[PDB]
Design a protein around this ligand. Structure first.
Ligand SMILES: c1ccc2c(CCc3ccncc3)c[nH]c2c1
Length: 351
């Protein structure tokens, strides 16, 4: 049943992993967790192993660890990060304090691709198709990613794409401040807290990404929140009375009304030389009123993706029980719940 584990110190941290994982080599960084690349001798796959930093330190961390594991165990889709394995060296709940998570090793993110390679319209078609395909899956389980940007999209040498790094923790105010890529892909309602957000925030992010694939350049590289809002409103226009009413914040609504009114720009004169179907799709995604944006399912049927669209191979997710989110528990209760999820994990099959 239980595998044999071996110990190894790598960069001032003790990795204790099953024997199946060999040639552990440190990768990236770790405020969320330390990450090693390894070779999985059971599957034959190169894998990334994450050891969680201080998982049951507070109630908020313990719940976040449970949330991450619940979410990762659910995701079973080609275009979304899947769990290969989850383990602990603990033999009981009483000595449980470390969680390790295993997934397929990724080399390149979409940021590396747009920076370093020239992309044809067919590449943009295929890349955006795959993001939307994964988003249809994610959104069908009532999961909102909340933080789609090129650095959270893993891409291989065949242009095959996966969505990673879900909005699990809140960002700090400081990492959202200034001339930063962490805010450039955020929908303005979430960036400025206009109203209760919903899954359509992710479609805004896809439009920003699509635009950057087409031009090679950030669409809204604001130097701060307000500079970024001005860049957004220059392109899409200032809001009308209908959207203004939906902005629940009185001060945010007051500030918007201080701005000089601007019409929506001609997107064919911004996205010069782009496929007219790409421009049409962008106009449907980069809509200020979140209720009027195209959804992922709607966008997959758009003519831009006619080469790739297959309605029989665009699956939806199994129902995801998210009722834990409204629940208030103790640390040892979240920890016990987390332990049950580690021990009940079944690896995905062979093909
Ligand atoms: C689940 C979520 C995240 C991770 C990580 C860190 C992110 C990553 C993913 C793939 N390759 C390299 C780095 C490693 N393993 C994980 C398991």
């Amino acid at each position: 049943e239980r595998p044999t584990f071996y110990r190894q110190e790598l960069n001032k941290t003790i990795w204790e992993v099953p024997e199946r994982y060999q040639n552990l080599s440190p990768v990236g960084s770790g405020a969320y967790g330390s990450v090693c690349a390894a070779f999985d001798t059971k599957t034959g796959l190169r894998v990334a192993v994450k050891k969680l930093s201080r998982p049951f330190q507070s109630i908020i961390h313990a719940k976040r660890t449970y949330r991450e594991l619940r979410l990762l165990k659910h995701m079973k889709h080609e275009n979304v990060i899947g769990l290969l394995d989850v383990f602990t060296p603990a033999r009981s709940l009483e000595e449980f304090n470390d969680v390790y998570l295993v997934t397929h090793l990724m080399g390149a993110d979409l940021n590396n691709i747009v920076k370093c390679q020239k992309l044809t319209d067919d590449h943009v078609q295929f890349l955006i198709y795959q993001i939307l395909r994964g988003l249809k899956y994610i959104h069908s389980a009532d999961i909102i990613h909340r933080d789609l940007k090129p650095s959270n999209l893993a891409v291989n040498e065949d242009c095959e794409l996966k969505i990673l790094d879900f909005g699990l923790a809140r960002h700090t105010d400081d990492e959202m401040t200034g001339y930063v890529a962490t805010r450039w892909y955020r929908a303005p309602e979430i960036m400025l807290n206009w109203m209760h957000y919903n899954q359509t925030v992710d479609i805004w992010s896809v439009g920003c990404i699509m635009a950057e694939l087409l031009t090679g350049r950030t669409l809204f590289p604001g130097t701060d929140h307000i500079d970024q809002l001005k860049l957004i409103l220059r392109l899409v226009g200032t809001p009308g009375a209908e959207l203004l009413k939906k902005i629940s914040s009185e001060s945010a609504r007051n500030y918007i009304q201080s701005l000089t009114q601007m019409p929506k720009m001609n997107f064919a004169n911004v996205f010069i030389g782009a496929n007219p179907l790409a421009v049409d799709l962008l106009e449907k995604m980069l809509v200020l009123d979140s209720d009027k944006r195209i959804t992922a399912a709607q966008a997959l049927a758009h003519a831009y993706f006619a080469q790739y669209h297959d309605p029989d191979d665009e699956p939806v997710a199994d129902p995801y029980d998210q009722s834990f989110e409204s629940r208030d528990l103790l640390i040892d209760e979240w920890k016990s719940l987390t332990y049950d999820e580690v021990i009940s994990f079944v690896p995905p099959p062979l093909d």
